[PDB]
């Protein structure tokens, strides 16, 4: 009747744990926030809210280590007016001293998921906006492969190949397991000053059922 079923897979994936962000360590499974981002990469408007209901894991948890040369700091805001009060060459030297930070990443491989999510109208929804219209727009885009931006498995260098599951969700690899993954990020509450909120993730039958991230009893 309602809801969606989007399947996403790729050779690489990295959902970095917040506690090991600097030396990237990925979650075993994509957190609901990553599913939010992937869904919004296909279709989103200010008049809607994406809610993730379930995440199905269809391939074994396989890890891998990749190390890269990365930058130490963000580029600072300049004042354009003074940019040519004199010829001021603005640049960032990646190779200069402490600017070069090497960061090792331990990331997943050959992932495959099916995302179940539905809709919700926000305060700034238009007088004519209806959940059905956005649902049909998303379904059409997913069927035709159109997307606002190419979805990625966490980091932009890991593109996601996505499809719409018209039929039944395929059987999972952990069909007979009840694996506890410990607390993991649910989403980030941007209303309460970007406050992260977590939930105890248990992978029953290979499907994770996070609590709704809009509910009041999960938010502080």
């Amino acid at each position: 009747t309602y809801g969606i079923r989007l399947r996403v897979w790729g050779d690489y994936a990295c959902f970095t744990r917040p506690e090991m962000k600097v030396e990237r360590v990925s979650y075993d499974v994509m957190p609901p926030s990553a599913a939010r981002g992937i869904l919004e990469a296909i279709h989103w408007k200010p008049a809607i809210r994406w809610i993730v209901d379930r995440i199905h894991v269809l391939r074994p948890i396989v890890f891998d280590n990749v190390r890269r040369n990365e930058v130490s700091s963000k580029i600072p805001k300049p004042n354009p007016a003074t940019a040519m009060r004199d010829r001021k060459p603005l640049y960032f030297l990646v190779d200069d001293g402490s600017n070069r930070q090497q960061r090792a990443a331990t990331l997943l491989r050959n992932v495959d998921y099916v995302i179940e999510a539905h809709f919700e109208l926000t305060d700034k929804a238009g007088a004519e906006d209806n959940a059905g219209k956005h649902l049909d727009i998303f379904r059409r885009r997913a069927r035709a492969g159109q997307s606002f931006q190419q979805p990625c498995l966490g980091c932009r260098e890991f593109p996601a190949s996505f499809e719409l599951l018209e039929g039944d969700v395929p059987l999972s690899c952990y069909a007979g397991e009840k694996r506890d993954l410990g607390y993991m990020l649910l989403d980030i509450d941007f209303e309460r000053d970007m406050t992260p909120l977590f939930f105890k993730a248990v992978m029953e039958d290979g499907v994770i059922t996070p609590p709704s991230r809009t509910s009041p009893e999960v938010r502080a």
Binding site: R87, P89, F92
Partner: protein, 270 residues
């Protein structure tokens, strides 16, 4: 600020002959190789660095083609700014910084959730078949310090890939470009850079590296018209009939492109 009105997916094929395309910092500088398949690996940031270097060398401080994230090959002789509140500063950056306009950046104002994401995106490039890097031992005439002078020679080593053909995928998102100003001339410059990335990257370690094929899928819609993964499948690369044993030249590989869906075009810049 006109911006491209089509979604692009491009597949770039490049190869290395007796060189190290991308040393692994976590393996003593051996070329990256995929543990799961044994294929050689070349991270995307390496290609992005090469593109930035090529554009910096080519435009040389043009009006709208300054490059922010440089290495110590920077040139400090001339710069001129187009000169066209957080929104205003970001617009200026995009207007007169090519890499920011193309790849994006982060400008210390996380108060603005909307980042500078940039249209262009590209993933890791992986060899079409497993590579077997060779270890080459070398010597040096002179010793660096008097302490080791007390026989005055050093035995280094140098890792090379005898040959490997790498496939790089990339995605350009028109809607993101519309928020940054990435225009069609920028797209032409990007194609040129991809074609001539390695022509200025020569060094003692990389050996000979060059771009062989560049297939571009031009979508009719502002969004896409067919799945990207189904388009990348049309580019099939296999081994020529008369070739056997390990590959050692591009002639060993035969590459063909299928018929694209009705809603997308196909180009071959090489």
């Amino acid at each position: 600020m006109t911006a491209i009105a089509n979604r692009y997916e491009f597949v770039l094929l490049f190869d290395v002959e007796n060189g190290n395309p991308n040393g692994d910092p976590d393996a003593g500088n051996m070329p990256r190789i995929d543990p799961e398949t044994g294929h050689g690996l070349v991270t995307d940031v390496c290609l992005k660095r090469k593109i930035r270097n090529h554009v910096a060398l080519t435009k040389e401080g043009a009006e709208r083609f300054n490059i922010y994230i440089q290495e110590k090959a920077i040139l400090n002789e001339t710069h001129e700014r187009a000169y066209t509140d957080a929104k205003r500063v970001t617009d200026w950056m995009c207007t007169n910084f090519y890499d920011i306009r193309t790849f994006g950046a982060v400008m210390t104002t996380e108060v603005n959730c909307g980042q500078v994401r940039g249209p262009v995106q590209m993933a890791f490039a992986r060899s079409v078949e497993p590579v077997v890097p060779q270890e080459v031992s070398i010597t040096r005439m002179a010793v660096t310090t008097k302490a080791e002078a007390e026989d005055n020679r050093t035995m280094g080593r140098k890792h090379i890939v005898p040959y490997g053909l790498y496939v790089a995928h990339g995605f350009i998102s028109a809607p993101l470009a519309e928020k940054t100003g990435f225009s069609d001339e920028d797209l032409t410059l990007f194609w040129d850079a991809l074609v001539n990335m390695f022509e200025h990257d020569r060094s003692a370690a990389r050996g000979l590296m060059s771009s062989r094929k560049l297939i571009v899928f031009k979508h009719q819609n502002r969004l896409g018209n067919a799945p990207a993964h189904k388009l990348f499948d049309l580019v099939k690369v296999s081994r020529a009939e008369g070739s056997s044993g390990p590959a050692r030249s591009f002639a060993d590989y035969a590459v063909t492109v299928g018929q694209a869906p009705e809603g997308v075009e196909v180009k071959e810049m090489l």
